[PDB]
Design a protein around this ligand. Structure first.
Ligand SMILES: CC(=O)SCCNC(=O)CCNC(=O)[C@H](O)C(C)(C)COP(=O)(O)OP(=O)(O)OC[C@H]1O[C@@H](n2cnc3c(N)ncnc32)[C@H](O)[C@@H]1OP(=O)(O)O
Ligand SMILES: CC(=O)SCCNC(=O)CCNC(=O)[C@H](O)C(C)(C)COP(=O)(O)OP(=O)(O)OC[C@H]1O[C@@H](n2cnc3c(N)ncnc32)[C@H](O)[C@@H]1OP(=O)(O)O
Ligand SMILES: [Ca+2]
Lengths: 215, 261, 256, 261
């Protein structure tokens, strides 16, 4: 039988799943964390302890940015429409792209090009930068070039961690899913009603009323 | 003219109007600096409370254990179909996530609800609980699996139960009840095991987590796997999928001529 | 062993076949979009009367402005630079029990009410409150007895006066509306209720009912995406004065 | 409190504030009463113009021909996967719709854009257009078919081209160029015919529909089929899909013990 799909990251056929060769429960038993599973499933590599400390902080820092932004607001709109959590969160996730979250992969991409082709106050940035430059020994050429914005900081850092270029948006997608789930729960706890924008929030730049011509 | 504005939405969990975003009143930079993790942010945004150490260790294992279960299941396969169709990651994973529901992944909330109801209303009457569920609800949420069974046990379930019993002091009436239900249901049919959704739901009810939050633990964890599958197919440059003809049981109308109007 | 079973369409022959009919031949013989809907959702070519009803349901339901959840979700995605299909998929995800997707249940319960509570609307309303919750097909955020929904009035008048359809479900729902609007003005028979009743009276498959709204409102959601793209609209961020920030006091993180 | 409001959204296509919706200024029920159709509402909402009778006849045919292509293809299959997972219709169809993009449906808009570029840049130079495309794009979008060819024509294409040439007086420069391109490409290899995506994409550019709108015709038409498939699976009470193990090539890492931290 010719297979329909080819997978390289996980095997569910045994007693429990294997993530890049490692048993899920053995990762739990030996003290590994969510950040380690992220490394295994997205990069097929168990992160080093410093890499795991950076992944953890990137996800924590990126988890939510309030209810006003497109991802969270999409989830809220769906929550208020009575849609179930997974589907509501999927609507918020659909907002992630070139304008909402996209500054991470683009920063990473252009600062990598800058390092190769042109080699020669936000408290979260000052925290992240000081953590990676002082509490780790990770070589951060892209970040160092950028130092010579949180999306800029995170994007440079992920290119410097050698994560595949295809994986970079994953950090923002996963992290913001925590906030979007949270917003859905918050609206459900409040028993929020359907949202319908107020008329004065809309500029109805519409055609004048006209009668339909006969045919 | 001006307008008297009434708020459109009300939010209690997060705010970005200050110096940096605040999660249930706490700054993310401070959470990072003081040694907290992803499991702590999950607790703040979903329960508005910093988890205890015992809770954080449980949340971490729930997420790790649930992260992925291969490419054959609806969530992963949906993400893979979209990846092969050349769809960008967030939109591809949204398609996979849309599969999460009563049958696949999204039975956590209702498993917690109904096992808690059973503990309260049928503590010494599992057959009463099962009969009530069959007549009034349908399949018992958190019971059953397409591939795991008495002969092919789910070590993810065995691990979470062993961890709770041995590495914590957590009192678990819902989980203990569900394990007694599993003995009764698996005597009827081997497929009627206590599954991962049922296990997680019971543990989270025993931790008194918000009832609405329960499915969130699966949704979030399995997003890790779905992103992983999208990346995997992109690394392989996988082509557009068309389901093979032999896998489709066609039972279609005969070819027929359109009649004149 | 097969993975799925399918009965509605087949692309293995010379061209795709919809319930056994070739689309080129349906076009050539003067059939329309409404006939293809009937073939793919009911496996039968509609009668001329049925096709005229389907057409009108779709046209009447196509759009209801940018303020409503489906359109606003599509607009939010358009403004975020998301491509059309994925943006409209976000809008479509909003269609459910509160907005747009009460057609199926409205048809299901009004059809049962005709048989089980023929001369007892209070008994039906009591059964629903205990067994279901809000009556699907009743209520609206903006339309009411004081601001009637002319879409509902039009569809009801078209059916009752311009077709020969026997409408026990729709007639029952109209009697229900007299009872509920006497209690509260917002409890009108809404578009979802009207469509659901009409489709049950037409003996359409019960699972198909929400499809008429999902498809029709896809026209509108695509329109809003195109409109925002033509305007080169920017990323939307909800104004802070539209949000009641009932957030926890800013606190210092305690030591572990 | 009172605020000086700036509108959050600007809309030009429809007004819902009155007794019924107004599509590009026209009352929805009056379009119904005066004998207009779905295709007329499509033109009003997507182009802000009531189509001419001939444009209306073309829109109708495009939608009908594009409505479904069987259950094996990504959009329908996504809807079927969600239907089998117990997901409600709108959410299930949304998953299938997510598959629509560069590989599935995208050849319509790509063919339109490039045959329009050829009419403008290579008006009487098909070899130059075909030389540039092979260098900067690869296979010409809208050209080629696996099973169809000169010996076995696509009757939908022959029907549509014949309709627009013999039942309308519409000027079709993009479609005319694509038919001249087909004469050159079919002479090289018989299978390089003008396909249905190429025929539709060219026609839409010739009807002067906005460039942003072209994908709408496939999206809306295939929503008919995706709804159909969801209903079909629900009528059957189909069970959850989980791909059989033999359909997966598990090109996975060797099993190893987790190292100590
Ligand atoms: C991480 C996860 O996804 S774990 C799974 C989460 N889902 C749930 O917990 C929901 C409840 N469980 C179920 O719906 C099912 O067991 C499924 C969908 C998970 C798997 O079932 P399937 O393999 O599709 O089989 P199907 O639904 O036909 O059930 C097989 C038989 O077991 C019975 N059965 C299956 N699950 C249950 C259940 N939870 N309660 C009662 N009876 C059940 C069915 O009635 C059927 O019996 P029959 O032979 O007399 O007809
Ligand atoms: C195209 C469409 O979307 S048409 C609408 C389709 N939806 C339905 O038919 C589902 C049933 N209806 C409903 O859920 C609601 O009427 C909605 C969501 C459409 C609008 O309601 P909202 O404006 O959000 O108001 P809310 O849900 O708070 O209800 C208003 C009041 O009317 C009552 N009410 C509203 N709809 C119903 C109903 N269908 N049955 C019974 N009571 C109802 C509520 O109980 C509430 O009463 P209260 O003031 O005593 O508490
Ligand atoms: Ca006039």
């Amino acid at each position: 039988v010719e297979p329909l799909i080819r997978t390289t990251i996980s095997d569910d056929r045994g007693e429990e799943p294997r993530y890049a060769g490692y048993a899920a429960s053995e990762l739990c038993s030996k003290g590994y964390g969510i950040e380690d599973v992220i490394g295994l499933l997205w990069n097929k590599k168990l992160p080093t302890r410093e890499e795991s400390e950076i992944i953890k902080r990137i996800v924590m820092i990126s988890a939510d940015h309030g209810p006003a932004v497109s991802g969270a607001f999409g989830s809220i709109l769906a929550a208020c429409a009575g849609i179930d959590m997974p589907q509501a969160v999927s609507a918020g996730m659909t907002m992630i792209g070139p304008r909402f979250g996209g500054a991470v992969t683009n920063a990473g991409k252009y600062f990598k090009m800058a390092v190769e082709d042109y080699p020669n106050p936000d408290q979260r940035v000052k925290y992240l930068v000081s953590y990676i430059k002082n509490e780790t020994s990770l070589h951060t050429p892209c970040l160092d070039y950028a130092l010579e914005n949180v999306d800029g900081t995170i994007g440079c850092i992920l290119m410097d961690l050698d994560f595949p270029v295809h994986s970079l948006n994953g950090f923002f997608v996963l992290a913001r899913t925590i906030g979007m789930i949270g917003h859905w729960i918050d609206q459900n706890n409040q028993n929020s009603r359907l949202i319908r924008l107020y008329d004065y929030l809309i500029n109805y730049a519409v055609k004048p009323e006209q009668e339909v011509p006969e045919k």
